[PDB]
Amino acid sequence: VVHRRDFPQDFIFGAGGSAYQCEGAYNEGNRGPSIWDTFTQRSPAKISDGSNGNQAINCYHMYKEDIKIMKQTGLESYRFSISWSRVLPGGRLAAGVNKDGVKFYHDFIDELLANGIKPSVTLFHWDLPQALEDEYGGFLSHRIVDDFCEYAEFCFWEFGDKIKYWTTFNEPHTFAVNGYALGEFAPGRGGKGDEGDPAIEPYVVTHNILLAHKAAVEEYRNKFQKCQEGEIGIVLNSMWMEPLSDVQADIDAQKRALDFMLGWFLEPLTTGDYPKSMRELVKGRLPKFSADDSEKLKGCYDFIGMNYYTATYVTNAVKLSYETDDQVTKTFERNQKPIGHALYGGWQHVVPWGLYKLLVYTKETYHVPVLYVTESGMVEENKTKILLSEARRDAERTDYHQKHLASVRDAIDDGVNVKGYFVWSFFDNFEWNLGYICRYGIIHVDYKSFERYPKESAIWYKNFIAG
Numbered sequence: 001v002v003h004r005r006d007f008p009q010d011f012i013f014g015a016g017g018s019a020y021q022c023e024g025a026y027n028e029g030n031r032g033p034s035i036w037d038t039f040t041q042r043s044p045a046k047i048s049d050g051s052n053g054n055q056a057i058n059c060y061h062m063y064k065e066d067i068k069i070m071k072q073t074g075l076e077s078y079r080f081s082i083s084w085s086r087v088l089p090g091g092r093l094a095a096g097v098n099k100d101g102v103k104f105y106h107d108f109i110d111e112l113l114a115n116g117i118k119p120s121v122t123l124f125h126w127d128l129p130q131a132l133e134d135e136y137g138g139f140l141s142h143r144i145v146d147d148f149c150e151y152a153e154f155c156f157w158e159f160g161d162k163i164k165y166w167t168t169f170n171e172p173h174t175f176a177v178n179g180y181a182l183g184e185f186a187p188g189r190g191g192k193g194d195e196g197d198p199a200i201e202p203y204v205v206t207h208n209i210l211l212a213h214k215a216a217v218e219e220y221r222n223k224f225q226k227c228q229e230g231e232i233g234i235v236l237n238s239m240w241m242e243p244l245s246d247v248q249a250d251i252d253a254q255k256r257a258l259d260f261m262l263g264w265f266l267e268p269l270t271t272g273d274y275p276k277s278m279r280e281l282v283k284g285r286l287p288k289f290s291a292d293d294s295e296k297l298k299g300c301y302d303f304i305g306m307n308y309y310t311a312t313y314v315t316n317a318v319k320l321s322y323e324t325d326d327q328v329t330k331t332f333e334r335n336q337k338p339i340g341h342a343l344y345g346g347w348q349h350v351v352p353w354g355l356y357k358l359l360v361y362t363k364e365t366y367h368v369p370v371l372y373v374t375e376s377g378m379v380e381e382n383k384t385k386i387l388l389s390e391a392r393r394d395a396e397r398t399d400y401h402q403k404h405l406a407s408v409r410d411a412i413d414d415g416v417n418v419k420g421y422f423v424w425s426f427f428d429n430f431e432w433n434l435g436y437i438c439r440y441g442i443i444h445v446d447y448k449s450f451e452r453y454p455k456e457s458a459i460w461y462k463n464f465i466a467g
C-alpha cells in the first residue's frame with residue numbers, strides 16, 4: 001500500500017547496473033584488462049563457481065534490446081558505469097584513447113535518450129585498469145588522483161553534454177574493505193595467505209579515494225557544471241545499526257559502527273576530518289588531510305547516493321585489522337529472534353525500517369542537502385532445475401520494494417530531502433565473489449544463452465511508475 005502519488009511530483013524512479021557485471025566483451029573493441037578480469041582469471045577459486053565477467057550478461061552487444069526492456073518497464077533513469085579500461089586501455093593518457101570504447105558509450109547514451117530514459121553515469125565501479133594497479137598499486141598510491149582526474153575530465157568532455165548526473169565512486173567502503181582487508185574482492189589483498197596488510201591498506205586506499213573524489217568534483221564544478229547543467233556526487237553504502245539493547249554501551253557501539261562504515265567518507269565531506277572515534281582508535285594508522293585538502297573537502301558533492309540492503313544488531317566487543325578496529329560485534333539475532341526475514345546467502349535480512357532510520361540519521365548527523373537511494377534490491381537463489389515460469393514469479397521481491405518505498409516515503413514525510421529510488425539490479429548480473437549463484441534482477445537473464453524475460457516485479461514496477 002504505497003502508490004506513486006505518495007511521492008513528490010519530482011522524484012525519479014530508476015534501476016541500475018554496472019559495467020563489469022553487465023557488459024562482457026572483456027577482450028573486444030580494444031578494452032584493456034581491469035583488476036576484476038585479473039582477479040577472476042588468475043584466482044578462480046576466489047570466485048564461488050569460478051566464473052567471471054568475460055561474457056557476463058553481454059550488454060555490450062545487446063544494448064538495444066536492453067534499452068527496449070528498460071522502456072517497457074517505464075524506467076525514468078538508468079544508472080550505469082563506464083569501464084575505465086574500455087575508454088583508456090592503460091588508465092593513463094599515454095597508452096591511448098580507445099575510440100571503439102567511446103563509440104560504444106555514445107551509442108548506449110544516445111539510445112537511452114532516444115527512448116526517453118535519462119542517463120545517470122558512474123565513473124568508477126571497482127573496475128580499475130590493471131595497467132594502473134601494476135604500475136603503482138592503483139589506490140595504494142596518491143598517483144591515482146591525477147590519473148582519475150584525467151579520466152574524469154575526458155568523460156565530462158566526451159559524454160557530459162548529454163548527461164546530468166555524475167557519480168565519482170560507487171561503494172568505496174566495499175572496494176576498500178573487501179579488496180584490502182578481507183581479500184574477497186579485487187585485488188584480493190589482506191586476508192589469510194594474501195599479500196597486503198589489513199591494518200594499513202584499507203585506510204590508505206580510502207584516503208586516496210577521497211582525494212581522487214575531490215579532484216573530479218572540482219574538475220566538474222569548475223570546468224563543466226555551468227555548461228552541462230548537471231550534478232556530481234558519491235555513492236555510499238551502509239547497513240542500519242540497531243543497538244542490541246537500550247544501554248549506553250550499545251548506543252556507543254551504533255555510533256562507532258556507523259562511523260567506521262558511513263562517517264569514514266561522509267565526515268571528510270562535512271567537516272574535513274575523519275570521525276572522532278576513527279581518530280581515537282586507528283591513530284597513526286589513519287592518514288591526515290593537509291589544511292588545504294581538509295578545507296576543500298567540506299561540502300565536496302552535490303548529492304549523496306545511498307545503497308541499502310539490510311540492518312544488523314550492534315553491541316560492544318571483547319592482529320590489527322580494519323575489521324576489528326571499530327569495536328563492535330555485529331549479530332543478526334536478538335533473543336535468538338532475527339531482525340527480519342533471512343534471505344538466501346544468510347547476510348541479507350529484509351528490514352525496511354532500516355532504510356528509514358539510515359536516511360534520517362544521514363540528515364541529522366551530516367545535513368546532506370540531496371539524498372538518493374541509488375541501490376535497493378533483494379537477493380534470490382540461482383535455482384537451476386526449475387522452469388523460467390516459476391523463477392519469474394518473484395512475489396517476495398515485489399513485496400520487498402513495496403515496503404522499502406514505504407520507508408522511503410516515511411523519510412520524505414519527516415523532512416529528509418530524498419529525490420530518488422533506484423532498483424538494484426535491473427537485469428540479473430555477475431555477482432562478484434559469488435559469480436552466478438544468485439540474482440537481484442527484476443528482469444531475468446539466462447546466464448548462458450543471455451535471453452531476457454521480465455519477472456513479475458518488473459510488471460509491478462511498470463505499474464507503480466505509471467501511477
Ligand SMILES: OC[C@@H]1[C@@H](O)[C@H](O)[C@@H](O)[C@@H]1NC1CCCCC1
Pocket residue numbers: 018170171174237307309375424440
Ligand atoms: O548486493 C551487492 C551490491 C552489488 O550488486 C553492487 O554491485 C554493489 O553496489 C552492492 N554491494 C553491497 C555492499 C557490501 C558487499 C556486497 C553488498
